[PDB]
Ligand binder design. Structure first.
Ligand SMILES: *[C@@H]1O[C@H](CO)[C@@H](O)[C@H](O)[C@H]1NC(C)=O
Ligand SMILES: *[C@@H]1O[C@H](CO)[C@@H](O)[C@H](O)[C@H]1NC(C)=O
Length: 213
């Protein structure tokens, strides 16, 4: 088990799986000025807090918590962007899922994940802010949407801000990302009818000082 030494990628970029960045590690090292952060424009919530938390971790393990194959009623591989290319073609963050309507329908999602592991889990998700009613319809069908997220300590409801915006890295849309630490035997619960960038992979983390000798 070796340290994870990020070359061209930020902490946020690696966690989310920025495709422009070329299973188990100890601590993480991030360079001073990584070229690749968030390829798609937007915000990473409480980023300073996450970086400090992650600097205190010396065991990481990436686990699949919501398999991409489990989205039977939503497209899970159709959402890509020229902001996030791979080998010259539009791509997307690899560790979260851009869910898109399927057959002109976006059923309301209810998904829970229960932390059956012995370690704390870092889980990330996001929201896509669309540019106008037409784009909203095209991608998600439903005009008025939300993402609700709950744990034993988190109670969040995200609502897209649908508005015309300047193009940043070619995109008028924005994506904001959020995270939490899910304690053992706690569960995270999602309900959404659109604009949801869903977790696929999460990270088991152990703080320095918490391991057996
Ligand atoms: C798509 O939705 C329509 C409307 O309900 C339905 O009639 C049709 O069978 C659906 N097609 C597929 C392939 O699910
Ligand atoms: C997680 O699963 C365990 C085992 O089934 C259960 O006892 C516990 O209530 C679940 N946690 C939550 C928050 O539902």
């Amino acid at each position: 088990v070796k340290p994870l030494i990020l070359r061209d990628c930020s902490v946020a970029g690696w966690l989310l799986g920025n495709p422009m960045c070329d299973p188990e590690w100890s601590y993480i090292v991030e360079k001073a000025n990584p070229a690749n952060d968030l390829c798609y424009p937007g915000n990473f919530n409480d980023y300073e807090e996450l970086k400090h938390l992650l600097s205190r971790i010396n065991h990481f393990e990436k686990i699949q918590i919501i398999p991409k194959s489990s989205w039977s009623d939503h497209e899970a591989s159709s959402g890509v962007s020229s902001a996030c290319p791979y080998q010259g073609t539009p791509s997307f963050f690899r560790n979260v899922v851009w869910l898109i309507k399927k057959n002109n329908t976006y059923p309301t999602i209810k998904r829970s994940y229960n932390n059956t592991n012995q370690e704390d889990l870092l889980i990330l998700w996001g929201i896509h802010h669309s540019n106008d009613a037409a784009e909203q319809t095209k991608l998600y069908q439903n005009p008025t949407t939300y993402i609700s997220v709950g744990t034993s300590t988190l109670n969040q409801r995200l609502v897209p801000k649908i508005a015309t915006r300047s193009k940043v890295n070619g995109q008028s849309g924005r994506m904001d990302f959020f995270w939490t630490i899910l304690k053992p035997n706690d569960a995270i619960n999602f309900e959404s009818n659109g604009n949801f960038i869903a977790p696929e992979y999460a990270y088991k983390i152990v703080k320095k000082g918490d391991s057996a000798i």
